[PDB]
Design a binder for this molecule. Structure first.
Ligand SMILES: NC[C@@H]1O[C@H](O[C@H]2[C@@H](O)[C@H](O[C@@H]3[C@@H](O)[C@H](N)C[C@H](N)[C@H]3O[C@H]3O[C@H](CO)[C@@H](O)[C@H](O)[C@H]3N)O[C@@H]2CO)[C@H](N)[C@@H](O)[C@@H]1O
Ligand SMILES: [Mg+2]
Ligand SMILES: [Mg+2]
Ligand SMILES: [Mg+2]
Ligand SMILES: [Mg+2]
Ligand SMILES: [Mg+2]
Ligand SMILES: [Mg+2]
Ligand SMILES: [Mg+2]
Ligand SMILES: [Mg+2]
Ligand SMILES: [Mg+2]
Ligand SMILES: [Mg+2]
Ligand SMILES: [Mg+2]
Ligand SMILES: [Mg+2]
Ligand SMILES: [Mg+2]
Ligand SMILES: [Mg+2]
Ligand SMILES: [Mg+2]
Ligand SMILES: [Mg+2]
Ligand SMILES: [Mg+2]
Ligand SMILES: [Mg+2]
Ligand SMILES: [Mg+2]
Ligand SMILES: [Mg+2]
Ligand SMILES: [Mg+2]
Ligand SMILES: [Mg+2]
Ligand SMILES: [Mg+2]
Ligand SMILES: [Mg+2]
Ligand SMILES: [Zn+2]
Ligand SMILES: [Zn+2]
Lengths: 81, 87, 25, 206, 217, 96, 97, 117, 129
RNA sequence: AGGGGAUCGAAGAUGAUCAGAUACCGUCGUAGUCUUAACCAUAAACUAUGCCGACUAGGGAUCGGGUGGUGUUUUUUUAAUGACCCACUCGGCACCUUACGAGAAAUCAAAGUCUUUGGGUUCUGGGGGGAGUAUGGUCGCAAGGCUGAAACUUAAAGGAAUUG
């Protein structure tokens, strides 16, 4: 810790750092793609859900909002892109 | 330090720190100079022939000495796979 | 004398000084 | 640049891992963070022993380089390998200091302890920090055996190890003396192991 | 002749180092008062001040004397020391001993023009003994030493020809004023100008060149 | 920091605030209040003629003892009575 | 000049602590100040415990304890040497004896 | 009480240093010894110097004593500090590590004799 | 609130290089930082610097070579006559030999000597030595 | 001003105490203490330390929030909301070590980045007294608050630390 690389820092330390504290502030949030217990229709849901999102018809509960990433319900799928 | 006609006028020219490039003064007795020994084939270092480094009172005190050598050593070549340039 | 009690002492002085001046109506 | 053969000589590797010099401290002290490989759970942070070896290499070569072997000071007050500094010191010029340091030894030209070395080496930079202070008074460079938890102040190039007792300390001085006797000296045959026992450098009993 | 007890005293008494600038350059802790005697003959000492100080015994008091001396030549090697002792001339004596163990290099300089043997300092410098800052400014030639007579003497033996000064603090405390100005000139060579930007090999430290004749006999 | 405005437009806040604090300077105060022309026995002049009322010996302060031989004088231009010391040795005999 | 950086004892980011009454002087003193040493005693002590356990019914029984937390102001606590004077760096140590 | 002052101790301490082989556990002989190799202005002073330096002896014949060293002690010092084991690293065939320090082997480009747990 | 943005920079530069570090992270990045950083680097007192693009005002990374005593700023940025550059240069510069008072003229950022040859002038900015 | 009035308790009354004892200590006790409505606007109202922004150093405890723990524990998926452990990261009340620095020192992660003197901005101070007095104004029912001089006097006053 005298001379180091600020231009090319390791992502080992940079990914445990703060969202604003990376060399360029990144979003730490992602986007799912989800279905029902019984339905194929794919909802595009945000990783941290302030709203309680529904899958459209038959008025389901996909996720209950938290102080953070939404808490999903029982079982259903997810894909991070 | 030159002079009028180009005739050097000065009493002495001090030594930059190898780590900080900062002058080492006369009362700088905190400072340290390091002698690393050149070798022939299969070791057995040559007397009179050294690789030399200078670490002033500051860097030694502030705690970058061991690290500022590994920093320095690899470049002229001493060691490999020791000091990272990134944390 | 105590700081505090010098205060009380002149706070009495200013009362008497107001009163004597009052007699000038 | 160093010839290939000076590489860690894998037979020596398991001698290290037998002496447990790979077992670091339970706290890091960020100047020692480049000297760690990873942290085993249940408390140990493993030292890279190749960086360790490359230090003994660099340590030696500087110990070697010092023109006169007699003033190169090897200091230990620690009964956990104070002994090794007598063994190291006979195998080189190396005037040892083993036991209490008697402060004012490098300063204070009167005292019976006076010295003016061009190099100083220390087992434990904490309990030997007395002399480390006096180092920077007289300009003397310094080598040390530094655990992960151990002070980084005023020590020049220094060697990581366990120094929680016994082997690692002696194992390094034994390795140090061996390596400084190999470098220049009379050992040669660098591939050839030493007859001398590493446990000769181990403090004993009762 | 003296009886050198230290590793440097050998290389001195032998005749193997003829200038202090070597002892300076490698930052060598001169421990022997006679070392700098040889290297610098005719090094002029002036006694600045003598004053008594008073402690108490298990009842009454204690009396002894503080001595303030400056040793320099004209060429930029200067020292300053304070010794306090029982006798007076003993304090003066041992004062000059400590004054010599302190002597220090000086980076001199020109004003606007490099003609003819630098008359001034390199940059502006300052140094502070507690509460007292003495600050040195590069005057031109013919200006002389602008400073209080107490410092002017130090800057004389410092080998300063022309200089400017500014002081902030308790100046009537003399022992702190000279120590302040002593930090000042004793800085200029630590001030890195573009002259000294020039890269250098790290000259080889005669301590190990003469290592033979050095170590104890 | 520095607690005082450096802004390029701040001249008046500076020019004023100094004009305000100058009042703390004793010498400056006296000049504006006209202290000498009012509160001083001399008019603010360097000398005053006056006439002696009574010869006055005055005891000295600690740690001294002697009689200081002064006089009471009534300034002509003024009328203000003032006490002045008569110096040297036995010059009190010179004034009546 | 400041003697302590707790100044008398620890507040550090509040405006008040409702003061407590001394168990000796009755002197008032903030709860954040005011030396408090919890004191539990044997209900019996002395050699009483022997002939008391003798004189009692119940098999072997068990012994209750009095529970009191005494609060002390400085002036009293020092006089009664619940606490004593220490040196410049001795005062520093907060470790309980 | 019976405490002996420094002139005594600082003598007896320096006697055993340079005279150890010629010194004994017998006081009365060391008394006669003290009159030869040393000079002591008064008789009574000598007996105390002898009396402690034999007490200093009977402890140095019972074990190493802190304040002083000498020839014969520093000799068996070098002698008695020798002993090596027959073999000690032996070790029992491979070497025992727990998984991680072993990765360092698979890191540095080495093999060794690997036993994990 | 952050009011200079340049002085916030030259401080971070001046700070670390006086603690021995070789590299410094500046943010945000003024084009006036850049022009200053230029005259610094071209006169040697610093190393080479690499602009960094956020979608924000952007960062910088400056390599420190040592050898730099002080980089600084004059706020407020005074109006300076031409004859009055001499009385500035004598003030904050270490010696008449070297050192740089850096202004901002209508011709743009430069040092005091570069100003002298062109015979221009403007508001003051900072200093380098 | 009503309501209230348990306790404690100015004034006071006493008993003791002392050469005296208008007190400290003891018994009683008015206002007060509590409340409602309305004033008052002072406290060592203290961290005796302005606010905003940046920068420079290590260390463990802890409060709140978030992220990762195919870590842990209690039930009857030993899976599920919890609590616990561990690592990371903001934001807190503090604390420790070092002095990188700073200071007259005591000390200070700011009280640093200050004669290499300027990021922005608000307030105050200019020897000790006299004196927070006099006067005017203003606010208050009043006690008082806010504002706030001068004449004159004086060589010290003061801070920190040291030895006694
Ligand atoms: N602003 C808090 C910061 O916490 C930082 O990190 C601290 C903690 O956040 C971090 O977590 C520690 C953990 O290391 C340690 N081994 C156990 C400890 N319980 C943890 O702390 C955690 O649990 C405690 C309650 O137990 C909570 O109060 C705390 O918020 C939480 N972070 O460990 C650090 C303490 O050793 C730094 N100390 C420092 O930047 C600063 O103090
Ligand atoms: Mg007050
Ligand atoms: Mg009237
Ligand atoms: Mg005593
Ligand atoms: Mg007087
Ligand atoms: Mg409190
Ligand atoms: Mg309060
Ligand atoms: Mg009623
Ligand atoms: Mg009652
Ligand atoms: Mg009464
Ligand atoms: Mg009487
Ligand atoms: Mg009487
Ligand atoms: Mg009476
Ligand atoms: Mg009576
Ligand atoms: Mg009463
Ligand atoms: Mg009533
Ligand atoms: Mg107030
Ligand atoms: Mg308080
Ligand atoms: Mg206040
Ligand atoms: Mg939490
Ligand atoms: Mg000026
Ligand atoms: Mg005043
Ligand atoms: Mg008032
Ligand atoms: Mg009024
Ligand atoms: Mg005092
Ligand atoms: Zn649905
Ligand atoms: Zn009490």
């Amino acid at each position: 810790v005298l001379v180091q690389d600020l231009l090319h820092p390791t992502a080992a330390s940079e990914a445990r750092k703060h969202k604003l504290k990376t060399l360029v502030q990144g979003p730490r949030s992602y986007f799912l793609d989800v279905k029902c217990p019984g339905c194929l229709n794919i909802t595009t849901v945000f990783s941290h859900a302030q709203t309680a999102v529904t899958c459209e018809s038959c008025s389901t509960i996909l996720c209950t909002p938290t102080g953070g990433k939404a808490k999903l319900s029982e079982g259903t799928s997810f894909r991070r892109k | 330090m030159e002079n009028d006609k180009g005739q050097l006028v000065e009493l002495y020219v001090p030594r930059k720190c190898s780590a900080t490039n900062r002058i080492i003064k006369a009362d700088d007795h905190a400072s340290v100079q390091i002698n690393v020994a050149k070798v022939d084939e299969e070791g057995r270092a040559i007397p009179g022939e050294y690789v030399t480094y200078a670490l002033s009172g500051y860097v030694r005190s502030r705690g970058e000495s061991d690290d500022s050598l590994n920093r320095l050593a690899q470049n002229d070549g001493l060691l490999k796979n020791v000091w990272s340039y990134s944390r | 004398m105590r700081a505090k009690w010098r205060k009380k002492r002149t706070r009495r002085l200013k009362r008497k000084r107001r009163k004597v001046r009052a007699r000038s109506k | 640049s160093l010839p290939a053969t000076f590489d860690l000589t894998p037979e020596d590797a398991q001698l290290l891992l037998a002496a447990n010099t790979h077992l670091g401290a339970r706290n890091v002290q960020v100047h020692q963070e480049p000297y760690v490989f990873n942290a085993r759970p249940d408390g140990v942070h493993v030292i890279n022993v190749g960086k360790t070896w490359e230090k003994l290499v660099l340590a030696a070569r500087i110990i070697a380089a010092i023109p006169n072997p007699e003033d190169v000071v090897a200091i230990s007050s620690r009964t956990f390998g104070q002994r090794a500094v007598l063994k190291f010191a006979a195998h080189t010029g190396a005037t040892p200091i083993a036991g209490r340091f008697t402060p004012g030894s490098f300063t204070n030209y009167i005292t019976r302890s006076f010295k003016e070395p061009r190099l100083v080496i220390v087992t434990d930079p904490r309990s030997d920090a007395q002399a480390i202070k006096e180092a920077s008074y007289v300009n003397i460079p310094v080598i040390a055996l530094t655990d992960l938890d151990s002070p980084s102040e005023f020590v020049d190039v220094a060697i990581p190890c366990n120094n929680r007792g016994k082997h690692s300390i002696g194992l390094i001085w034994y390795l140090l003396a061996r390596e400084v006797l190999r470098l220049r000296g009379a050992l040669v045959d660098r591939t050839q192991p030493w007859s001398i026992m590493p446990d000769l450098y181990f403090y004993r009993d009762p | 002749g003296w009886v050198p007890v230290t590793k440097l005293g050998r290389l001195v008494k032998a005749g193997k180092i003829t200038t202090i600038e070597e002892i300076f350059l490698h930052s060598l802790p001169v421990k022997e008062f006679q070392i700098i005697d040889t290297l610098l003959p005719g090094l002029q000492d002036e006694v600045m001040n003598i004053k008594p100080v008073q402690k108490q015994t298990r009842a009454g008091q204690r009396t002894r004397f503080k001595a303030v001396v400056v040793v320099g030549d004209s060429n930029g090697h200067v020292g300053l020391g304070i010794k306090t002792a029982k006798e007076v001339a003993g304090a003066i004596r041992a004062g000059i001993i400590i004054a010599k163990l302190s002597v220090i290099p000086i980076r001199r300089g020109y004003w606007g023009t490099n003609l003819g043997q630098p008359h001034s300092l390199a940059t502006k410098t300052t140094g502070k003994c507690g509460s007292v800052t003495v600050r040195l400014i590069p005057a031109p030639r013919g200006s002389g030493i602008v400073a209080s007579p107490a410092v002017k003497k130090l800057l004389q033996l410092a080998g300063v020809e022309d200089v400017y000064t500014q002081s902030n603090g308790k100046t009537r405390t003399l022992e702190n004023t000279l120590k302040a100005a002593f930090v000042a000139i004793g800085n200029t060579y630590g001030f890195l100008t573009p002259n000294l930007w020039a890269e250098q090999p790290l000259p080889v430290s005669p301590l190990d060149i003469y290592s033979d004749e050095a170590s104890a006999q | 920091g520095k607690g005082k405005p450096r802004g390029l437009n701040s001249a008046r806040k500076l020019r004023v605030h100094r004009r305000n604090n100058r009042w703390a300077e004793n010498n400056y105060k006296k000049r504006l209040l006209g202290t000498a022309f009012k509160s001083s026995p001399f008019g603010g002049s360097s000398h005053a003629k006056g006439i002696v009322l009574e010869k006055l010996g005055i005891e000295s302060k600690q740690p001294n003892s002697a009689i200081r031989k002064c006089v009471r004088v009534q300034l002509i231009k003024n009328g203000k009575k003032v006490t002045a010391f008569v110096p040297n040795d036995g010059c009190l005999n010179f004034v009546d | 000049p400041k003697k302590r950086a707790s100044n008398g004892r620890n507040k550090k980011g509040r405006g008040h602590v409702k003061p407590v009454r001394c168990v000796n002087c009755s002197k008032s003193i903030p709860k954040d100040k005011a030396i408090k040493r919890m004191a539990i005693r044997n209900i019996v002590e002395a050699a009483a415990v022997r002939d008391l356990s003798e004189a009692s019914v119940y098999p072997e029984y068990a012994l209750p304890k009095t529970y009191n937390k005494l609060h002390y102001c400085v002036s009293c606590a020092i006089h009664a040497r619940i606490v004593r004077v220490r040196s410049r760096e001795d005062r520093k140590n907060r470790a309980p004896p | 009480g019976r405490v002996r002052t420094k002139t005594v101790k600082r003598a007896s301490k320096a006697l055993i240093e340079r005279y150890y082989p010629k010194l004994t556990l017998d006081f009365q002989t060391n008394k006669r010894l003290c009159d030869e190799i040393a000079t002591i202005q008064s008789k009574r002073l000598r007996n105390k110097i002898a009396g402690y330096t034999t007490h200093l002896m009977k402890r140095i014949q019972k074990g190493p004593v802190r304040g002083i060293s000498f020839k014969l002690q520093e000799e068996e010092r070098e002698r008695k500090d020798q002993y090596v084991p027959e073999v000690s690293a032996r070790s029992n065939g491979v070497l025992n590590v727990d998984n991680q320090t072993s990765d360092l082997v698979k890191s540095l480009g080495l093999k060794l004799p690997l036993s994990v747990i | 609130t952050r009011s200079s943005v340049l002085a916030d920079a030259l401080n971070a530069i001046n700070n670390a290089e006086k603690t021995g570090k070789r590299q410094v992270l500046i943010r945000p990045s003024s084009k006036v930082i850049i022009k200053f950083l230029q005259v610094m680097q071209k006169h040697g007192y610093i190393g080479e610097f690499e602009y960094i693009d956020d979608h924000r005002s952007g960062k910088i990374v400056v390599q420190l070579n040592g050898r730099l005593n002080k980089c600084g700023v004059i706020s407020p940025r005074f109006n300076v006559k031409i004859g009055d550059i001499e009385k500035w240069t004598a003030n904050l510069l270490p010696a008449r030999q070297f050192g740089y008072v850096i202004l901002t003229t209508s011709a743009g950022i430069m040092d005091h000597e570069e100003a002298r040859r062109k015979h221009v002038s403007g508001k003051i900015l900072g200093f380098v030595y």
